[PDB]
Amino acid sequence: QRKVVSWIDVYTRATCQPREVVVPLTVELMGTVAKQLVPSCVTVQRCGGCCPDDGLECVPTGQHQVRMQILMIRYPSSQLGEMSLEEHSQCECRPKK
Amino acid sequence: QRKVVSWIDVYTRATCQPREVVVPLTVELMGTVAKQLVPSCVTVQRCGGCCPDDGLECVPTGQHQVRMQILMIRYPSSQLGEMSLEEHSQCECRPKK
Amino acid sequence: QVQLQQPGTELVKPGASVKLSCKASGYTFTGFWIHWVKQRPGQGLEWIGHINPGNGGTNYNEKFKRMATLTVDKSSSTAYMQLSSLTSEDSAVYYCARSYSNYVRAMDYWGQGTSVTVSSAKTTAPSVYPLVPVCGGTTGSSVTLGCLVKGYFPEPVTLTWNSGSLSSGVHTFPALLQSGLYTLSSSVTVTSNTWPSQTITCNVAHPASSTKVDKKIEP
Amino acid sequence: QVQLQQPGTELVKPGASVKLSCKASGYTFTGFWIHWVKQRPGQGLEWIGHINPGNGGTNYNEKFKRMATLTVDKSSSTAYMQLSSLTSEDSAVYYCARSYSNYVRAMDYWGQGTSVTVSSAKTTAPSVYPLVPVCGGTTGSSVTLGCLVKGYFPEPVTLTWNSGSLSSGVHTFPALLQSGLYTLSSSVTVTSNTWPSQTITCNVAHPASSTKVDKKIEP
Amino acid sequence: EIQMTQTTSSLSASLGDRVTISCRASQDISNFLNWYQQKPDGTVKLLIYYTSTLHSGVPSRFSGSGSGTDYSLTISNLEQEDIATYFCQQGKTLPPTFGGGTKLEIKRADAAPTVSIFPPSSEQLTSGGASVVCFLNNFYPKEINVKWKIDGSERQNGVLDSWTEQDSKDSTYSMSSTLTLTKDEYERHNSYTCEATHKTSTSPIVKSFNRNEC
Amino acid sequence: EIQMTQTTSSLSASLGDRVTISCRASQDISNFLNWYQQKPDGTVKLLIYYTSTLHSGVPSRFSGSGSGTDYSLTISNLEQEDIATYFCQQGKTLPPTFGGGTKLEIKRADAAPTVSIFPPSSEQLTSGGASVVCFLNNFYPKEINVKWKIDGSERQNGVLDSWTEQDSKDSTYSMSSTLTLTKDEYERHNSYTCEATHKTSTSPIVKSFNRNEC
């Protein structure tokens, strides 16, 4: 047993907008607070998807940086600290160069 | 002006579960019926996130292939056809072998 | 939560121009084509033109050519229609609707529209009259009241009964042009014991003249 | 939408063992530790042990060294507790709750609980008695009726008035042990005009005996 | 332009009936046709946007059909919430061409109108005008006739006849006949008559009053 | 095991008061404390899970404080929600240790119990047994005394005294005195009395009835 998805429902979630995207916590993105951060990944609203026209790219209009509570595994004393990440507000489709 | 995301709200969406992920449609991944299809990308529920303990992978337990209505830009006559992608049902944290 | 806003009423004198509004909210504005459709009183929908808010792509119908200039605002998320040189022929309801494609062109969500009335006639306030039942009968099982507003210009007019609380068995009749002025009527039906025991009020509002008065119907 | 399931009542005999259930539904089961907590009637919470359904790693409290066994099922999504060799000291309410990380030890969501009773006593049915106000006495503004169920075993019992529709000013008193049997009482207060014009019924349900009868209160 | 032909306007059917609304084109549009629902208040929404594919939040009753040049909307189970003029629109090539509306009315039992005459209000008579309003309040079908008789003699000028749209509650039409007159003539003339001719009776239903209060 | 200690258990405060509940640990838990709310029906929920960090669906009234060996849960504004026993659990190391659940009652105006005596039902007497129930129901505070008197003589055996928990409506306590007797002795006596001693009156509020129906 199976069911089909309407094309309207296909493109609505596929069109350029702000959406929930997982971001892996790396030492290259956020530095030394612990050997391991818990959770090792978080979720932020990012501009994903694709525009109808081929010459149109999906880029953020404006972004606001949000801060999240994160468990820092420190072996001197483990603490539940704070970190920050960039999060998009709205996206648009622009012509490419 | 400022909001602090609670650690519980942080890990709840960060845990290994089925989530909406944008998948770019390519000629390699799903083949050629036309020059380009619209939308050029789709959204399917996939196993994303991260496990609490390092040493456990985020892998699907069950999955079901769903079919979506896609606009196929063909030059003899453009038509709104059907396509299929593999979608995940439920995920679990299994130790990495 | 995906709608388009259009000011339901609009008035201009013949010869002038209107910049119609199509406020987009609830979705990515620059991702869907914004269409504009014309409809004369009880006559088939006529396509005027669509505009792409993403790349600034403009498209117009042949007969409406220089009849209709389409523009978009990315800062306000609003599509605009500039109708140049208006006449009695252009007195119609103009809609706006979004569509996703480059081929299918299926306008999924429409707005409420804009009823553009084009006349140089003087804008005047209405006169509310309580339509009292015939002097001494008849009844009984149910009694009909009624209300009349004669000589108002232009549209629209909002008619309610008891602040809209009496929203049962109400007949609001559409306005018609008599001697260059609108005359509208309405009627309600309640049981013989409801009136004049419970005092029923006719509530009229003409926003264009800014003058609105509710009349209490007494026998 | 996230919750844990525990059977409210559980009856066993001295010497026997129970496999308590914690049915998890609403989240990824194998990503959170499942804790089990013991609570005696009106006493502090005692940690028994936690289990990780993800890897199978387990931890038990020292004093429950041989007496709790924790198991999990990836299918159906259910955590289990095997209480080996039960005594009268083990007669307590057992909870199941979930925490996230190894470091924090914070169990965010709990189950409803499992009141485990151990006795090996004879399970018998109650006898409902309608409490008559008085043989023509007190009548002022409000009158109280009452209900009684003496000699039922074991717990629990469901008590309502008029199919639970009369949920205003109801006093249901907790069960106590008398002569090795439970005796429970309840009372409802209504105006002197309501009764005995509107007939009131005492709804009793003892599911362990399977036999339950509602009684009509009459003066 | 690619002519979009919808060769029916008046359509009346009973509740729970299989109703087919068809459209024909000038050429092959290759299964590009959309069905739109314009409710009496002027709200347009898209029901079926391809051959047979539903919009989000549309009952399964609406069935799409037709391939090539002929395309038809099919309501399997008609209800009172389906009173609307349905349009078809091609999408093969611009412009996007719409067809003529089909006005979907719902068949019910024929009902006699309740007539009530109303003399000009004392508020109006002090201003210099006099208007006699005569409501006919619910009736079916929408083929009513009104005739004013001032002192037995017919009046045609000043008569305003406005109809209400198809009712969603009880499927009954209503119209209001408003006779506008001058006070100077209103005061010459005594005894008025509001005649109404309909399908429910051969004898015209009459509501008349004297202009002195009889 | 770290002996997590709560010094107070009995606690009563009026509505809209700054209520503070404190905890003391045997050693430094480094800010790893979690406050839990156990409702009268046994349902436990997590209120504050760190020093001062809130769980989803918890009012801003609950304030978390304390840094090291000493921590406290502070309710800024007290309401009738907030009738529960509050626990604190350390998360430094296993096991996870809970403290003594502090019962939070709410202070209100003192009231007299509504005494009502009930003779054994005709349904009970036909089965060979008699039980007299004396309800007293709606009173502050939960310190109350009941004394049965059969023909003036006190009887202590057969008395069952069940108290209700703090009411979430008007903050009133209630208890039931069920005196179980044998019918063969119940027939041998006349008047039955249930006395009630409370803070409201030094004189015990008396409700009695004669066996031969008053």
Query: Strand pairing partners for F160?
Result: F178
Sketch out chain C's domains with CATH numbers.
Answer: 1-120 (2.60.40.10), 121-219 (2.60.40.10)
Structure tokens at C172: 């609001």
CA gyration radius for chain B?
Answer: 18
Give the DSSP letter string of D54-95. Answer: TT--EEE-GGGTTTEEEEEETTTTEEEEEE-S--GGG-SEEE
Cross-strand partners of F45: D109, F37
Sign of CA dihedral A35, A39, A43, A48: positive
CB contact under 8 A, F31 and A79: yes
Please tell me what resolution, in angstroms, this structure has.
3.4
C159: nearest Cα among C205, C218, C199, C110: C205
Could you tell me how far CA C71 lies from the centroid of its own chain? 23
Measure the CA angle with vertex F95, ends F89 and F96; round to 5°: 15
User: What is the C-alpha to C-alpha distance for residues E142 and C112, in angstroms, rounded to an integer?
Assistant: 27
The amino acid that residue A57 corresponds to is: E
Cα dihedral F147, F152, F157, F158, rounded to 10, equals -80
Does residue D44 belong to the interface with chain F, where contact is any CB pair within 8 Å?
yes
Rounded Cα distance between D94 and D116, Å, is: 7
Residue found by looking up tokens 């051959």 in the block:
E51
E99 touching C, CB under 8 A? yes
Nearest CA-CA distance, residue B19 and chain D, Å: 12
Judge whether E108 is closer than 8 Å to chain C, CB to CB: no
Nearest to E134 by CA among E192, E186, E173: E192
Which residues on B lie below 8 Å from F56 (Cβ)? Answer: 6, 8-9
CATH number for A1-97 (one of 2.10.90.10, 3.30.565.10, 3.40.50.720, 1.10.10.10): it is 2.10.90.10
Tell me if E1-107 shares its fold with E108-211.
yes
- φ and ψ at A7, to 5 degrees? -60, -35
d(CA D142, CA E12): 62
Residue from A23, A41, A80 to probe the interface with B (highest B Cβ count within 10 Å): A41
Q: Which of C110, C79, C85 is nearest to C18 (CA)?
A: C85
The chains in contact with chain A, meaning 3 or more Cβ pairs closer than 8 Å, are: B, C, D, E, F
Instruction: Tell which A residues from 7 to 46 touch B, by Cβ distance under 8 Å.
Output: 7, 10-11, 13-15, 19-20, 22, 24, 36, 38-43
Q: Looking at beta carbons, which residues of chain D come within 8 Å of B51? A: 31, 54
Per the CB < 8 Å rule, is E56 touching A9?
A: yes
**Across the A/B interface, how many CB contacts are shorter than 8 Å?**
100
Question: Rounded to whole angstroms, how far apart are CA atoms A6 and A8?
Answer: 5
Q: Give the span between the Cα atoms of F139 and F135, in whole angstroms.
A: 12
Longest dimension (CA), chain F: 72
CA distance E176 to chain C (A): 7
Distance, in Å, from the CA atom of E54 to the CA atom of A8, rounded to the nearest integer, reads 9
DSSP-derived 3-state class of residue F48: strand
Count Cα neighbours of F161 within 13 Å in the Cβ-side half-sphere: 12
Choose among A46, A29, A30, A48: nearest CA to A87.
Answer: A46
B13: amino acid identity, one letter: R
- Please give the radius of gyration of chain E, using alpha carbons only, rounded to the nearest integer: 23
Strands E115-118 and E62-65: unpaired
Are C20 and C80 within 8 A, CB to CB? Answer: yes
Neighbours of B65 (CB within 10 A): 10
CB contacts, 8 Å: E34 with chain A:
none
Angle of CA points C188, C192, C194, to nearest 5°: 70
Q: What chain E residue is nearest to C173 in terms of C-alpha separation? A: E164
Q: According to the entry, how was the structure determined?
A: X-ray
Q: Residue C153: CB partners within 8 Å, gap ≥ 6?
A: C119, C121, C122, C123, C124, C180, C181, C182, C208
Compute the distance between CA of residue C53 and CA of residue C113 in angstroms, rounded to an integer.
19
Query: Which of the residues A70, A73, A78 would you substitute to probe the F interface, choosing the one with the greatest number of F C-beta atoms within 10 Å?
Result: A78
**Closest-CA residue of chain A to E54:** A6
- Find out whether C128 and C152 touch, Cβ atoms under 8 Å: no
State how far the Cα of C77 lies from the Cα of D187, in Å rounded to an integer: 64
Sign of the Cα pseudo-torsion (E72, E78, E79, E85, in order): positive
Q: Considering only alpha carbons, which residue of chain C is nearest residue E47? A: C108
> What length does chain B have?
97
Superfamily covering domain E1-107: Immunoglobulins (2.60.40.10)
Smallest CA-to-CA distance from D155 within D176, D170, D127, D172 is with D176
Write out chain F residues lying below 8 Å of A79, CB-based.
30-31
Give Cα C90 distance to the centre of its chain.
Answer: 16
Classify E9 as helix, strand or coil. coil
Contact A15/C74, CB-based, under 8 Å? no
Q: Which residues of D66-102 are buried (b: 16+ CB within 10 A; e: fewer)?
A: ebbbbebeeeebbbbbebeebeeebbbbbbbbbbbbb
DSSP string, chain D: --EEE--SEEEE-TT--EEEEEEEESS-GGGSEEEEEEE-TT--EEEEEEE-TTT--EEE-GGGTTTEEEEEETTTTEEEEEE-S--GGG-SEEEEEEE--TTT--EEEE---EEEEE--------EEEE----SS---SSEEE--EEEEEE-SS--EEEETTTT--SSEEEEEEEEETTEEEEEEEEEEETTTTTTS-EEEEEE-TTT-----EEE--
Q: Which two tokens stand for residue E56?
A: 């989000």
For residues C146 and C109, the answer to whether their CB atoms sit within 8 Å is no
A53 in contact with C at a CB cutoff of 8 Å? yes
* B53 min Cα distance to partner chain A (Å): 8
Which residues have a Cβ under 8 Å from the Cβ of E42 and sit 6 or more positions away? C93, C112, C113
From E91, E117, E137, residue closest to C189, measured CB to CB: E137
Search chain A and give the residue with CA nearest F49.
A80
Burial of A34 (0-12, 13-18, 19+ CB in 10 A): middle
Task: Nearest by CB to E43, from C112, C130, C175: name it.
Answer: C112
Every domain of chain B and the residues it spans: 1-97
- Interchain contact, A16 vs C31, CB within 8 Å: yes
Chain C residues whose beta carbon lies within 8 Å of the beta carbon of residue E172 = none
Rounded distance between C-alpha atoms, residue D213 and residue D106, angstroms? 45
Helix, strand, or coil (residue E85): strand
Q: Residues in chain A whose beta carbon is closer than 8 A to a beta carbon of chain F?
A: 69, 77-80
Class of the domain covering E108-211: mainly beta
Q: Which residue of B has its CA nearest to D100?
A: B52
CA dist C173 and C171 (Å) reads 6
- Domains of chain E: which residue ranges? 1-107, 108-211
Query: How far is D163 from chain A, CA to nearest CA, in Å?
Result: 42
Query: Would you tell me how many other CB atoms lie within 10 Å of the CB of residue F147?
Result: 17
Query: Comparing C-alpha atoms, which of B37, B40, C99 is closest to residue A49?
Result: B40
Q: A69: nearest CA in chain F?
A: F53
Rounded Cα distance between E149 and E177, Å, is 12
